[PDB]
Amino acid sequence: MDIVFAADDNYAAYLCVAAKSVEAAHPDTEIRFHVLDAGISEANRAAVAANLRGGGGNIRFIDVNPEDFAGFPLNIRHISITTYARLKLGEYIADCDKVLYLDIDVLVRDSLTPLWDTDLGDNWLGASIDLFVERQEGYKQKIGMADGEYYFNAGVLLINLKKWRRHDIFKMSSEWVEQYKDVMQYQDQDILNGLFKGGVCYANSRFNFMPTNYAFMASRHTDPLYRDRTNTVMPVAVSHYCGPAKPWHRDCTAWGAERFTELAGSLTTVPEEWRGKL
Ligand SMILES: O=c1ccn([C@@H]2O[C@H](COP(=O)(O)OP(=O)(O)O[C@H]3O[C@H](CO)[C@H](O)[C@H](O)[C@H]3F)[C@@H](O)[C@H]2O)c(=O)[nH]1
Numbered sequence: 278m279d280i281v282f283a284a285d286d287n288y289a290a291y292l293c294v295a296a297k298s299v300e301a302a303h304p305d306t307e308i309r310f311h312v313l314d315a316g317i318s319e320a321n322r323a324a325v326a327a328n329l330r331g332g333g334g335n336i337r338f339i340d341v342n343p344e345d346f347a348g349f350p351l352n353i354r355h356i357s358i359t360t361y362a363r364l365k366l367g368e369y370i371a372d373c374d375k376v377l378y379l380d381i382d383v384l385v386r387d388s389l390t391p392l393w394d395t396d397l398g399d400n401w402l403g404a405s406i407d408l409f410v411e412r413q414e415g416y417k418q419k420i421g422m423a424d425g426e427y428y429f430n431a432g433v434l435l436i437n438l439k440k441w442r443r444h445d446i447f448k449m450s451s452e453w454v455e456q457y458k459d460v461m462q463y464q465d466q467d468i469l470n471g472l473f474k475g476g477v478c479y480a481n482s483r484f485n486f487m488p489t490n491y492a493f494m495a496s497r498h499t500d501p502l503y504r505d506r507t508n509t510v511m512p513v514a515v516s517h518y519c520g521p522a523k524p525w526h527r528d529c530t531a532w533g534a535e536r537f538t539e540l541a542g543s544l545t546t547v548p549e550e551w552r553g554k555l
């Protein structure tokens with residue numbers, strides 16, 4: 278399968294751990310990594326690759342200009358401008374009709390094949406629902422969504438790249454931002470939801486298990502589809518540490534954070550400059 282990550286130099290060490298978590302969960306599946314590189318040093322690219330399978334034979338870094346998204350809001354402190362690079366995925370990747378995009382703060386704990394094998398039809402992408410935002414009274418509607426259109430989290434996206442390449446996603450994104458810049462609270466995540474509402478395939482929350490999903494272990498909608506998708510089917514396949522509390526931080530009470538440390542400790546090569554970060 279084809280996996281996409283996006284990272285600037287600051288997240289290079291975390292990218293490596295996340296990527297290794299994907300390889301570990303797929304011992305007999307070819308994993309082709311495509312990294313939207315917003316400024317990763319040559320040393321860090323070599324180090325990320327040195328730790329992956331075959332010494333990095335299956336990872337390609339794609340240069341992205343962070344200035345491209347200079348006009349987009351960045352109100353969430355722990356998030357850098359690189360978070361918007363995903364918007365030009367159709368411009369950055371030509372060889373794939375479908376790719377599975379993952380945030381850097383994820384820890385894959387089970388096979389992603391069921392998600393990867395999902396037939397997206399003419400939908401724009403497949404994603405898991407964000408319980409936190411969905412229950413934020415009146416927010417969803419502020420960005421033009423209907424009660425029946427579920428707000429998805431942008432941290433795990435099975436993207437119908439072939440469809441994306443038929444459109445100018447960045448231009449559509451820019452126009453949407455112009456329209457909702459004064460109300461959007463979740464940056465790139467809002468853009469994706471606004472542009473694709475009504476054309477989203479929903480995946481089970483096991484593929485994007487966040488703190489709120491853990492805490493839910495009332496129910497916002499009676500809709501059986503909503504309930505089916507938000508009721509996580511064990512085991513968790515993807516741990517997503519959405520929010521300020523990261524597994525590489527101090528006092529991370531987030532569930533499954535220990536797997537991060539175990540993986541970081543298994544690294545083949547660990548640059549002196551990564552010692553602190555990891
Ligand atoms: O120093 C940094 C910080 C962030 N990033 C990128 O930005 C993504 C954005 O943020 P987090 O993973 O930390 O975001 P968070 O999960 O907290 O937020 C929710 O809202 C975010 C809004 O901008 C994104 O859409 C994200 O995918 C979604 F899950 C990262 O995965 C990473 O690719 C970097 O490269 N370097």
Ligand SMILES: [Mn+2]
Pocket residue numbers: 380381382432517518519520
């Ligand atoms: Mn994230």
